[PDB]
Amino acid sequence: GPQPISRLEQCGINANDVKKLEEAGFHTVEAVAYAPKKELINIKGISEAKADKILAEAAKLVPMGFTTATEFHQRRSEIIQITTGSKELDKLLQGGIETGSITEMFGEFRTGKTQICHTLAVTCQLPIDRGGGEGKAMYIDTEGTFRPERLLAVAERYGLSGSDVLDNVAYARAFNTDHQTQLLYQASAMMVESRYALLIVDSATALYRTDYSGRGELSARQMHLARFLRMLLRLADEFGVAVVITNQVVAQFAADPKKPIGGNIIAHASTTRLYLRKGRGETRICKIYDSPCLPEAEAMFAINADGVGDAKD
Amino acid sequence: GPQPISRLEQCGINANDVKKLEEAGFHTVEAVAYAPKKELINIKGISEAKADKILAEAAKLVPMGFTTATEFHQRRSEIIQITTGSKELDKLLQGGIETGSITEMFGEFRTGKTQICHTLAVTCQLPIDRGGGEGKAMYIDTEGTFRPERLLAVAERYGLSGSDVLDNVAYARAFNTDHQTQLLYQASAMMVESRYALLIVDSATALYRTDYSGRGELSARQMHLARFLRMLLRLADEFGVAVVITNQVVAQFAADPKKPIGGNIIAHASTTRLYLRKGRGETRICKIYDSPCLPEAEAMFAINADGVGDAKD
Amino acid sequence: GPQPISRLEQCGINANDVKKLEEAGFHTVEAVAYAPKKELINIKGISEAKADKILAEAAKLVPMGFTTATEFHQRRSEIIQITTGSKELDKLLQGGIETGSITEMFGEFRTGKTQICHTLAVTCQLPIDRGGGEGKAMYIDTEGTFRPERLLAVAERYGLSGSDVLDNVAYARAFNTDHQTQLLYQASAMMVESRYALLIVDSATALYRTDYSGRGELSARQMHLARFLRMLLRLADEFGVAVVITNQVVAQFAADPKKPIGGNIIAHASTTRLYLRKGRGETRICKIYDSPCLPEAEAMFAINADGVGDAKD
Ligand SMILES: Nc1ncnc2c1ncn2[C@@H]1O[C@H](COP(=O)(O)OP(=O)(O)O)[C@@H](O)[C@H]1O
Ligand SMILES: Nc1ncnc2c1ncn2[C@@H]1O[C@H](COP(=O)(O)OP(=O)(O)O)[C@@H](O)[C@H]1O
Ligand SMILES: Nc1ncnc2c1ncn2[C@@H]1O[C@H](COP(=O)(O)OP(=O)(O)O)[C@@H](O)[C@H]1O
Ligand SMILES: [Ca+2]
Ligand SMILES: [Ca+2]
Ligand SMILES: [Ca+2]
Numbered sequence: 001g002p003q004p005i006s007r008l009e010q011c012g013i014n015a016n017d018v019k020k021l022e023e024a025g026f027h028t029v030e031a032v033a034y035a036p037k038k039e040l041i042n043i044k045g046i047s048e049a050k051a052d053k054i055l056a057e058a059a060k061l062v063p064m065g066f067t068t069a070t071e072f073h074q075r076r077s078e079i080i081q082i083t084t085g086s087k088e089l090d091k092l093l094q095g096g097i098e099t100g101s102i103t104e105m106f107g108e109f110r111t112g113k114t115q116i117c118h119t120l121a122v123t124c125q126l127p128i129d130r131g132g133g134e135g136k137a138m139y140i141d142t143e144g145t146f147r148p149e150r151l152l153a154v155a156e157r158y159g160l161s162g163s164d165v166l167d168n169v170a171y172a173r174a175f176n177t178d179h180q181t182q183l184l185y186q187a188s189a190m191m192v193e194s195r196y197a198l199l200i201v202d203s204a205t206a207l208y209r210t211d212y213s214g215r216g217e218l219s220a221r222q223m224h225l226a227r228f229l230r231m232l233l234r235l236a237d238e239f240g241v242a243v244v245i246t247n248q249v250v251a252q253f254a255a256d257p258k259k260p261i262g263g264n265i266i267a268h269a270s271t272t273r274l275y276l277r278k279g280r281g282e283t284r285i286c287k288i289y290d291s292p293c294l295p296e297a298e299a300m301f302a303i304n305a306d307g308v309g310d311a312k313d
Numbered sequence: 314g315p316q317p318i319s320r321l322e323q324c325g326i327n328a329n330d331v332k333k334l335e336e337a338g339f340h341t342v343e344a345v346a347y348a349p350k351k352e353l354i355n356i357k358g359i360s361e362a363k364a365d366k367i368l369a370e371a372a373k374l375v376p377m378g379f380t381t382a383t384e385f386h387q388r389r390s391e392i393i394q395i396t397t398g399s400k401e402l403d404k405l406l407q408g409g410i411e412t413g414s415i416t417e418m419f420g421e422f423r424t425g426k427t428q429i430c431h432t433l434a435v436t437c438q439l440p441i442d443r444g445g446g447e448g449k450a451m452y453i454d455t456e457g458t459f460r461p462e463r464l465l466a467v468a469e470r471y472g473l474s475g476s477d478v479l480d481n482v483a484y485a486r487a488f489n490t491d492h493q494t495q496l497l498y499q500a501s502a503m504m505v506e507s508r509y510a511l512l513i514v515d516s517a518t519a520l521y522r523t524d525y526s527g528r529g530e531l532s533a534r535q536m537h538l539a540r541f542l543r544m545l546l547r548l549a550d551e552f553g554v555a556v557v558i559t560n561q562v563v564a565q566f567a568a569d570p571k572k573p574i575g576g577n578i579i580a581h582a583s584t585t586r587l588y589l590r591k592g593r594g595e596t597r598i599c600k601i602y603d604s605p606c607l608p609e610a611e612a613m614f615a616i617n618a619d620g621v622g623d624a625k626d
Numbered sequence: 627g628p629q630p631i632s633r634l635e636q637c638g639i640n641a642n643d644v645k646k647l648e649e650a651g652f653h654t655v656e657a658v659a660y661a662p663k664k665e666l667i668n669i670k671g672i673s674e675a676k677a678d679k680i681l682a683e684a685a686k687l688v689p690m691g692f693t694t695a696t697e698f699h700q701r702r703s704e705i706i707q708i709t710t711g712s713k714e715l716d717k718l719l720q721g722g723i724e725t726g727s728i729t730e731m732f733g734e735f736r737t738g739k740t741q742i743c744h745t746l747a748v749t750c751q752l753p754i755d756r757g758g759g760e761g762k763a764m765y766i767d768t769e770g771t772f773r774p775e776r777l778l779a780v781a782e783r784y785g786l787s788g789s790d791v792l793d794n795v796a797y798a799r800a801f802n803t804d805h806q807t808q809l810l811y812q813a814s815a816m817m818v819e820s821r822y823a824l825l826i827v828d829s830a831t832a833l834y835r836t837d838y839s840g841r842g843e844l845s846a847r848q849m850h851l852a853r854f855l856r857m858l859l860r861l862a863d864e865f866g867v868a869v870v871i872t873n874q875v876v877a878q879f880a881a882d883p884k885k886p887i888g889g890n891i892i893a894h895a896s897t898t899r900l901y902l903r904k905g906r907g908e909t910r911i912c913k914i915y916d917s918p919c920l921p922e923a924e925a926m927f928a929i930n931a932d933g934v935g936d937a938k939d
Contacts, residue, residue: 036489038490038491038525066485068483069461069482069483070479072484073461076461226526233457265526266523268457292458292459293463347801348802349802349837350804377798379796382791385797386774578835578836578879579836605741
């Protein structure tokens, strides 16, 4: 559980300015502790006089200094690996989708990217014993291709009350690139008033191929995309929630898998890349393209009327 | 072994001001001996009255005057060349990573930069007979892509106790440019209370492409980066420890290899540049871009589940 | 051979004050003869009473009055032109590096500035018949990029005993601007106890871009640099030794070649400027930017494992 921004009020910072820290999007103390000095002066009100003082006070409330690897080992061993819904993939991922980082699944059209995200939108409220996360979910949508009709079909596969499963998940369409980033600001708000566990952006680079569809602004197409993925990694180690993004890839304009999603400036954004491919048969393959800890391996899976599942045969 | 700042107390300097030398970041006597007169007056407390006196006393405790090349030859022949983990590269580097200077590996995405740094994070506590350094390690991380899961895999390749290997290494994430430089201050502290041998900044220019992502502050993007690489060369001849930084390079915003890492003001920062490139096959090549002593040569290597290794065939 | 300061003791000056002339840096009689009345009163001890008397006595010991051009012609024809190591450049320079003045080579990064200085650090102890100078050498270093590994490689190219070549050269790192100027004071000392022939400052303006890296002190960045180049021209006609400085230049903060090295107050410091540039091919060009006697011309050269050499083809 993070530390809300109200705890910083009693720490030595005024009240009229803490509300100003809020309007900038910062909702907790780690959000400012993970922020540089340059970003706080950009606020129209506050200046360098307080900015030194606030960041100094925030530093003590958030562990920021060095630490051992053993202490980081037993703390990294404790992160939740969200159940993928198919036992073959859990072994490929040594648990499943790992929270606190960016998970980027990219594959050709018709590969289950939309339904994998759907199945994950319910497997996250499963109890930890069931490999879940006991946390709320969120599914910001861009293609317009999300609908509860598939969610209750997966609740019955795992024995849940779909009446409350739809309550434990939120949703909003995205029409524009500026509305995609703006929606994260709102998203960053209600993640404080609750305990979400899985944000889903499907698809991330979808809306960037339609608005920024010119040849002169290829620079701006990535500058604006970088600012988007920045706050996404932001919200990942801020609330420690899993974030899963989606991309559509061509076989032969961030579509070439030879280049990462975060263009070149933020290319270190995605920490786990899963390439989804239809095999020679009617059976799907997930390939873990890059994840320092997990091998470059493969597994097979399939999709049923009840979500992601293991291969039939 | 350096000379701690406490030895300067008994040399003729007060106690309330030696604590002030500490708060400025100076932890030993060489740290002030390698400092100019301009930098000590910038302290809010002390003035030019003592600054002449302190630097005069520090001068005698640290060999500062001229010397012969023969005396520098046999003293430079004694520096440790950290074992790279692949025998082909030791010949390319005439030993491996040379301590007391800045080592900058830069290559395209997916080139082992992250895992080479990983393998070096254990090869440094090897005994000198095993080409190691018998010194602690440090891995300040920026991409978030570091994890012990690969370290114990390399300890078994060299026969070590991974339970203590993680104890002999420290680690901390970096989120902001101002937090990158601030973390060195803390780093400069616990390097006195122990004997580190290899600092690793991976990646150095990573966080400078995300915060300073505008067009007007291209000057400030390098001014702040210079102050970072300054203290890095600082800590290199201060404790005589090896410092290895990392950079991600585009094929076709310090990403063009035609320009050095330290922009233009501190461009003399990196003393050994190694360009990492995937060949026409599935085999990697390290090329020593610039190192006055080592030829502009090439070697091949590969990465396994147990760290950097020689080519399979 | 200069006249040491001890000869001034028997000339009519006391002993307790001649030691005071020493502590001020003045090691011979020309050093005070080339000094103004204003500079001697700045000493805490002596006053205008002796200052008139000392400078009057020093005047007779050092030829100071007028002279003909013929007498200056045959005396200027006798100055040594240090062999550059590449026959093409000797013709461009009508002999090579001319002693008794300031030689400033400036070029882009990766132009041989470091290795040209290296090759000159051995060509100076060559006998005069071999175009050398039969004098000791000195290489005060700032970038940290000097090492004997290249010196013995050039001794074998000219047939020398590298065991003694390193003895005939001295060296010291420079970390700060105040340590750069302070090192000249020591340098001015042991140049009396021996016969040096080539001082090398590589690079001169390097350390002035790191300490004086602010916007308010652009005045002080040159004031302090002027005091440095002052004593450098000082030591040039004092011991008549060659002094070669180095500068790193940007293509598009004394980096613009449109402005000289000595900023504006001492801009007459450098007497020969050589611009080093990588041509359209892998071959280097030296261009003599300014030298009243030598034409504005060009030549080509190259660098091998054995120092500066003529073009291969
Ligand atoms: N309700 C469903 N029940 C079963 N299979 C489905 C269902 N909807 C889609 N599929 C199958 O899953 C794939 C499409 O899933 P989807 O996640 O929408 O993929 P993508 O977004 O890549 O087009 C196709 O192979 C399709 O036959
Ligand atoms: N655990 C591992 N075991 C074996 N090979 C790995 C492992 N992790 C990554 N690799 C391989 O090494 C490269 C990635 O290494 P990494 O140091 O993370 O590179 P970079 O940071 O340049 O992306 C890829 O070729 C990948 O296949
Ligand atoms: N030991 C060496 N043997 C041969 N060529 C070298 C050697 N070291 C450097 N070079 C070459 O000389 C140039 C670098 O020389 P250097 O004097 O260090 O230049 P700069 O200081 O301008 O970077 C490059 O073209 C490099 O390929
Ligand atoms: Ca879809
Ligand atoms: Ca990396
Ligand atoms: Ca150089």
